[PDB]
Homo-oligomer: A and B are copies of this chain.
Amino acid sequence: KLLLANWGLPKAVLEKYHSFGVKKMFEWQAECLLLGQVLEGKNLVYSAPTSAGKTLVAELLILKRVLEMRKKALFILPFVSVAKEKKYYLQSLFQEVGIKVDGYMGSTSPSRHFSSLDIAVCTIERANGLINRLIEENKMDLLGMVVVDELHMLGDSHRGYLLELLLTKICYITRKSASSNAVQIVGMSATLPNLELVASWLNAELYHTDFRPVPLLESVKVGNSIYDSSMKLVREFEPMLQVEDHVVSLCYETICDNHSVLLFCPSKKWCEKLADIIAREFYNLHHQAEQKELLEVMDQLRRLPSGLDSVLQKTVPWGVAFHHAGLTFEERDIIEGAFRQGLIRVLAATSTLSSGVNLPARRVIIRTPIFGGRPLDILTYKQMVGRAGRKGVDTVGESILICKNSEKSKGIALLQGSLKPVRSCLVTGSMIRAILEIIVGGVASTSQDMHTYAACTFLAASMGAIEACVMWLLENEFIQSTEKVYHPTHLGSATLSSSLSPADTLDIFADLQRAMKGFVLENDLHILYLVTPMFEDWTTIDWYRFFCLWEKLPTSMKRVAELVGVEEGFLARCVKGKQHRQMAIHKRFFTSLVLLDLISEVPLREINQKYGCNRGQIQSLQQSAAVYAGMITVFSNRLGWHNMELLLSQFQKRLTFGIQRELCDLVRVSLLNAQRARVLYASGFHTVADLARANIVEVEVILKNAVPMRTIWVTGRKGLTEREAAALIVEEARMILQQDL
């Protein structure tokens, strides 16, 4: 029984698994999935270490559910990058067996409809919208199982409350049908203390494991000695070569052992300095003063849109790199891609890598217990170290936290600490959407039943103001009051369909309706002004630099600013010598100005030099602003505004890829991101229609030129050869022609 072949799986799936190296099944997964009545329909919640293989239980459960009862399923993942990686893994796994998978990661939407789509591996923000749409036209029989990830994020988080709302809605719809389970709910979590309460909230049978494929031993150093967690000295620290911190020495111990190291750094500036030093310390400690594959990785960065970084130039060709938020969204995969293969040996990363993709490393070093001026959180610390120890390669995983003076007392708190218990995050702006997701979907109409909905939520199961907050929806025209029985309105029916929080829609409805009075069409700014989401903390603005940009803007552009409240009299004038809604407009204006260059195909390096915001926050802004244009368009569609939908129809695709109107059809190929279609456009190919009929040898030469054997890079498949990618461009464009008609 302790072998995958005994368990019921398709032959192709098992063969693909053997290719991935997973041939032995853990005992905890087998006992958990055999435990209870989970297989026959009962929903399940369990927790395991990150390196223990949490994904196996969910994957075999969803495969069994799909093969047993033909029903579409979901897959809820926090971030866009992890969602993309998971979708690619699931596609490579489910190609032959026939369960086509596609994802809704913000801007990108599957070409095929959800009826043909089976497993929608998509983020929470779009999973909630898809669940709402499925609820809308009484088509929930397709849903058979929803897979959630890191249920511990449903507490204090900017998007986990959406996951909690979706799960409680599914539980409500399941209980209502009882008037074995219609839809199953499975998830995985970290070492939560209260997971029984969450498991019983979804009436899920609980199981918690601390099993690890390789041992993990945390460590803290005190000067020139290493202390274990429980007041124990496990080893005496002795630096071999260096030119109290001794940060370089720890990597050197592992480097001579032929293994990698993760050196997580606190801040943006700290990442560059630390990876520079280790490469500089590799000048003398190994020269007294795979190379072939390292150059190719260095070659991969040469013809990226932003080229190769100056700081990376002095470090990459020795096995030392670094990866933070400020780096390009393209470089981040390549640098992380080589780490899996082992080309790179030391990384200088920030805290963002903790919740990102899986990056195994024998030794993980954390520079300071203080991350960004605040103590390190326990929840991120569990995933912070959990990467230590490769399955089947390394017999020991370690973590060496670095503490100084009195910070050791705060530094040691995480070693003996435990993950904080989850909350509900539920007047509350996170709950105004909760009922409005159900009152306007037609699922619940009577108020007494709507009260019973609040009994199905996390807050009720944890153990007043629910009814009084409907009156708030009564005030804001969201719900019309009749004989009580609640019915949706025009504004309310649109908010649910486009998946916006009702807090935002109050301003958007007044802002989108203020575009009637005066609209401009010569420049895309005013259209772009209505799709910039917010300002958040994407970048620190430079007032003086915006002054010089304000003067050099064309007279055409200066008409938009006065049309949306931006003042020529006050713009980087009174701030220098020294209104909450005004800064939310100026920074909305700046976010539209940056996006104007992004849709004008200005090079990212030139934009960085001109806009002062590094490329890390630019690709993290055009990705977020692309989702907004796809939500404003849908919001205007349901509201009976056909004209505004016409102008904003094409602006989701333009922001995603940073292209112009001419390349809109060409970019439908996933292998033409921002430059592989522009040079291809200049080659006399203006549409994806005739591109499918292109000469195979013709596209080889044209793609070789325009440089800013696997030298080209396409997202999802790591590096690729020029001949293969060009052959894939025509192949990808080929299948588009008939599958959409």
Give me the interface of A with B, judged by CB distance under 8 Å: 513, 515-522, 524, 527, 556, 559, 641-644, 646-647, 661, 741
Contact = CB atoms under 8 A, between A and B. Distances in A.
Contacts of A661: 642
A47 to B, nearest CB: 49
Residue of A518, A524, A644 with highest tally of chain B CB at under 10 A: A518
Residue of A521, A646, A647 with highest tally of chain B CB at under 10 A: A521
A687 to B, nearest CB: 14
A650 to B, nearest CB: 8
6 contacts: A516-B522, A516-B556, A517-B518, A642-B661, A643-B647, A646-B646
B519 A518 contact: yes
Contacts of A520: 516-519
A522 B643 contact: yes
Contacts of A524: 643
A646 B654 CA distance: 15
B519 A521 contact: yes
A464 to B, nearest CB: 41
A653 to B, nearest CB: 14
A556 B516 CA distance: 9
A646 B524 CA distance: 13
Contacts of A559: 516-517
Contacts of A646: 646-647
Contacts of A513: 522
Contacts of A741: 741
Nearest to A661: B642
Contact of A521 (B522, B556, B644): B644
Contacts of A521: 515-516, 519, 641, 643-644, 647
B522 A641 contact: yes
Contacts of A518: 517-520
A645 to B, nearest CB: 9
A520 B517 CA distance: 5
A736 to B, nearest CB: 13
Nearest to A741: B741
Contact of A647 (B516, B517, B641, B647): B647
A741 B738 CA distance: 10
Given A516-B521, A522-B643, 7 more contacts: A515-B521, A519-B521, A521-B643, A521-B644, A521-B647, A646-B647, A741-B741
A73 to B, nearest CB: 29
Contacts of A642: 661
The 7 A-B residue pairs with the shortest CB-CB distance, nearest first, are: A521-B643, A519-B519, A518-B518, A516-B522, A521-B644, A516-B520, A642-B661
Residue of A513, A517, A641 with highest tally of chain B CB at under 10 A: A517
Nearest to A641: B522
Residue of A520, A556, A641, A661 with highest tally of chain B CB at under 10 A: A520
A643 B517 CA distance: 17
A516 B642 CA distance: 19
Contacts of A519: 518-521
Contacts of A522: 513, 516, 641, 643
A519 B642 CA distance: 15
A491 to B, nearest CB: 15
A517 B641 CA distance: 21
Nearest to A660: B642
Nearest to A737: B741
A727 to B, nearest CB: 26
A643 B515 CA distance: 15
Nearest to A644: B521
Nearest to A650: B646
A199 B559 CA distance: 58
Contacts of A643: 521-522, 524, 527, 647
A213 B644 CA distance: 63
A513 B647 CA distance: 18
A279 to B, nearest CB: 49
